[PDB]
Amino acid sequence: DTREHLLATGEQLSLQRGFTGMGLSELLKTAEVSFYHYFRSKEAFGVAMLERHYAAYHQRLTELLQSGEGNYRDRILAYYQQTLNQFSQHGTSAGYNSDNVYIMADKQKNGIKANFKIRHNVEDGSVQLADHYQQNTPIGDGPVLLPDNHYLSFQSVLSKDPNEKRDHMVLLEFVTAAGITLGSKGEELFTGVVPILVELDGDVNGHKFSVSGEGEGDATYGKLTLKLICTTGKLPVPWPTLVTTLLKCFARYPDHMKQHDFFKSAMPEGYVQERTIFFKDDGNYKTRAEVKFEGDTLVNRIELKGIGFKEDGNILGHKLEYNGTGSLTVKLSAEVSDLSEDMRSAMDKGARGVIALLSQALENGRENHSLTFSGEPLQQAQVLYALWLGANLQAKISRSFEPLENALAHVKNIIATPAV
Numbered sequence: 247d248t249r250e251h252l253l254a255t256g257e258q259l260s261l262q263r264g265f266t267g268m269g270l271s272e273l274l275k276t277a278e279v280s281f282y283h284y285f286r287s288k289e290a291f292g293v294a295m296l297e298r299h300y301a302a303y304h305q306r307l308t309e310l311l312q313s314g315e316g317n318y319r320d321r322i323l324a325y326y327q328q329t330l331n332q333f334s335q336h337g338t339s340a341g342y343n344s345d346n347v348y349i350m351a352d353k354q355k356n357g358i359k360a361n362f363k364i365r366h367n368v369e370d371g372s373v374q375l376a377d378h379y380q381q382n383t384p385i386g387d388g389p390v391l392l393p394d395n396h397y398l399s400f401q402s403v404l405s406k407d408p409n410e411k412r413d414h415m416v417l418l419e420f421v422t423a424a425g426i427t428l429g430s431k432g433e434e435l436f437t438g439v440v441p442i443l444v445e446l447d448g449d450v451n452g453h454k455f456s457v458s459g460e461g462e463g464d465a466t467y468g469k470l471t472l473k474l475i476c477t478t479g480k481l482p483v484p485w486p487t488l489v490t491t492l493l494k495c496f497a498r499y500p501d502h503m504k505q506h507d508f509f510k511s512a513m514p515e516g517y518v519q520e521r522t523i524f525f526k527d528d529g530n531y532k533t534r535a536e537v538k539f540e541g542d543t544l545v546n547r548i549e550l551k552g553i554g555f556k557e558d559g560n561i562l563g564h565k566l567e568y569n570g571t572g573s574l575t576v577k578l579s580a581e582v583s584d585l586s587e588d589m590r591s592a593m594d595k596g597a598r599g600v601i602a603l604l605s606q607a608l609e610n611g612r613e614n615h616s617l618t619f620s621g622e623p624l625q626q627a628q629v630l631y632a633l634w635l636g637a638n639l640q641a642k643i644s645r646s647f648e649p650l651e652n653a654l655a656h657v658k659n660i661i662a663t664p665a666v
Contacts, residue, residue: 249284252277253295254337259371261340261571265292266584276371289586296589299574300596302338307600311607318611322604322630322661326654329638330420330647332570333402333489336365336373341573341638344399349423349508351392357383357517358393358508364523366486366560367567374560377524378490382508385538386515393506396425398497402489404568405645413476415485418647421468421497429504432513436465436495441543444474444492450552451529451562453482459492463544465510468498483552484566491521491533493546514539529555572642575600579635601627608661618664630657 255277259268270288274280285291307325314321331344345362352359359381366374384390398421405416444459459474474485474492481488495509509517516538523531535548555562571577575596582590604627611617619626637653 248279252279252281252284252291253298255371256291256295257299257338257574258336258367258373260295261574261577262367262369262371262567264581265295265578265589266581272371289588292586292589293592296578296592296596299338300592300599303342303575303596304599304603306339306342307603311603317616318607318614319617319661319663322607322611322617323654323657325604325630326634326637326650326657329573329634330641330650331401331403332572332642332645333400333404333486334364334366335570335572336367340571341576344401346397346399346424348395348397348425349393349506350395351508352381352383353392355381355383356390356392357381364490366484367571368560368565369567370565374528374566375526376487376490377526378521379524380519380521382494382520383518384512384515385517385536386512388515389511391430391505391508391511393508394426396423396503396506398423398494401647403570403641403645403647404486404489407473410473410475413479413481415472415474415488415492416645417470417472417474417489417492419468419470419493419496420647421470421494423497423499423503423506426503426506428502429507430511432510433504433507435513435539436463436510438466439464440496442470442472442493442546443540443543444472444546444548446488446492446548446550448483448488448550448552450483450531450550451555451557453562454478455482457481457488457492463493463496465496465498468496470496483561484564484568486566486568487523487525487531487561488550490523491531491535491548491550493537493544494519495537495544509537525555525559525561528559528561529553569642569645572638576635576638576642580639597631601631603627604630611661615664617661619661630661633657 256273311321328343334345347362361379364376368374401420403418439462442461446457448455456478457474458477459472461472463470499507519535521533531552533550537546605623609623633653637649640649
């Protein structure tokens, strides 16, 4: 559909450029399409793009708050929870959901396999797809837990050390297993905070490079903190393309799922993690990593080979955004100022449809004893919206999980489970 394609394109463009900065020629270029054929003006296009965006988000909020997992309180917490991820985002869902990687047993190999799509943002507004095909196999001979089908929820943010001169990446991940409704000796090595060492030897199209990182992971909270330095000069590829290559052992497996943690069970001997990553319309990475304990440190030692890249493509030409975009509602909330009145009204109605959804959830949860809170639904809905808006925004400025963690902790406190 031509009209949908333009609106979809213009949303991504605004997600990155903003609306007032999105030019019409740049929109038809990236969309490969004219224009007044389908829209009266850029202003009318913007109203339509806004109404389309909020219609999809109201529907996403509706099925979460009225039909999601758990009770009304759990759904309200998830309304915050699904916004922590700032990596691999696109389209109507960008800034609204974590990235779920489906884990599956590979009994033939006594390990696990996965396949998933990573989406990088090209600075021109198009999206670089990266198809991951992954196999993991124990290094040791000891028995390993072979899991039933589940997934790992990945939430990541990339930042920079302001004192670091070298080409480098700061990477923070929150990773949680889920998908099963109702351990091992290796599990015991992860009860506390564990030093990490990462080493990558890379060769992409003949450009060699070495990446060396150090950090710590906290599996009880599914937390991973790394700072990775390119030790041979400029990284000849965009840092976002190495994120998945540069520790699923640090995932938080909830109590009822401990029998399905293959990654901790293979420890301390460890496991081999192999991938092919197919970059659409470009080349591919093949990676081989040993993840294992060396003394008290968890080591991820990696070799990487890339063949078939375009020297002027998105990867070798460094055309990839380093940061996530976040959501459009926050990106454009930021933009009211120069907007037309018809589009000022469009955000107003979009933000109010969200608040109304939060209010119904608070009211319904009261009535069915999912939750108690001091205040009334509509006013409390507005406080929750504002907190959600400020926290996401401040999570983007600081490139950190802290604001949403603190905000979510606040929400658990004020939207309480009723006394027994």
